[PDB]
Write a protein that binds this ligand. Structure first.
Ligand code: 8UY
Ligand code: FE
Length: 226
């Protein structure tokens, strides 16, 4: 067993099997995590992270879609490889899900505008995305001061998952009805990278209609090998 294999079998698999939610702290370590943050901010400064209106209407996310091989996206690429490796090692142990592919990385800036995101389900209408992964980059973050707490309400288990958006934290959860969630108002700028993994059969059905998500949120790219 390699380090990502050990993490999957001893931790991620039983977490996803039972709670459908998994949190991994110090996922990349301080050094590479630092390098990922550096690149995201460099993307932000280059004007590479790009609509307001769709009770709450006004958004504010500045996003870019990163494949991983672009100039100054190497560390982001390395993050994706590490997340991929972890998902690879879960194959056949998460149930019926065949995960062949995923979205590109959604590198995102979430400014402290004092607004949260209302209770939502990532994939309400069978668009093919089965697993959401969010990698957070916020150092010195205190929720009681800066807000921005994620709360997931899993349908299987009578609990609240209160997830602080902490630097070098990987969050993994089912994208469908099982995990409705809301992000509380925040009062400082945040960065996070999100990938969604596709279920082969569900995304095939979705494409057979056209119930796939719009834009890059519905564009498939293969999962990395070792
Ligand atoms: N850091 C940070 C940070 C803030 C907000 C969101 C965000 C926005 C919109 C929908 C949604 N669902 C789950 N997280 N999330 C993700 C990461
Ligand atoms: Fe969400």
């Amino acid at each position: 067993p390699s380090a990502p294999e050990r993490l999957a079998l001893d931790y991620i698999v039983p977490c996803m099997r039972y709670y459908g939610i998994c949190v991994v702290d110090s996922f990349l370590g301080a050094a590479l995590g630092g390098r990922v943050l550096a690149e995201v901010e460099a993307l932000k400064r280059g004007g590479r992270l790009r609509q307001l209106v769709s009770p709450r209407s006004i958004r504010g996310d500045q996003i870019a879609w990163v494949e991983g091989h672009e100039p100054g996206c190497r560390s982001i690429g390395a993050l994706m490889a590490h997340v991929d490796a972890v998902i690879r090692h879960c194959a056949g142990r998460l149930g019926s899900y065949k995960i062949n592919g995923r979205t590109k990385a959604m590198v995102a800036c979430y400014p402290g505008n004092g607004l949260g995101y209302v209770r939502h389900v990532d994939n309400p209408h069978g668009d093919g995305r089965c697993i959401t992964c969010i990698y957070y980059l916020n150092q010195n973050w205190d929720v009681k001061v800066h807000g921005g707490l994620l709360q997931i309400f899993p349908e299987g288990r009578p609990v609240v998952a209160n997830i602080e958006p902490l630097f070098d934290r990987l969050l993994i959860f089912w994208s469908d009805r099982r995990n409705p969630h809301e992000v509380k108002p925040a009062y400082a700028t945040r960065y996070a990278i999100t990938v969604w993994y596709f279920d082969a059969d569900e995304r095939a059905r979705a494409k057979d209609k056209y119930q796939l998500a719009s834009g890059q949120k519905g564009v498939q790219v293969p999962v990395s090998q070792p």
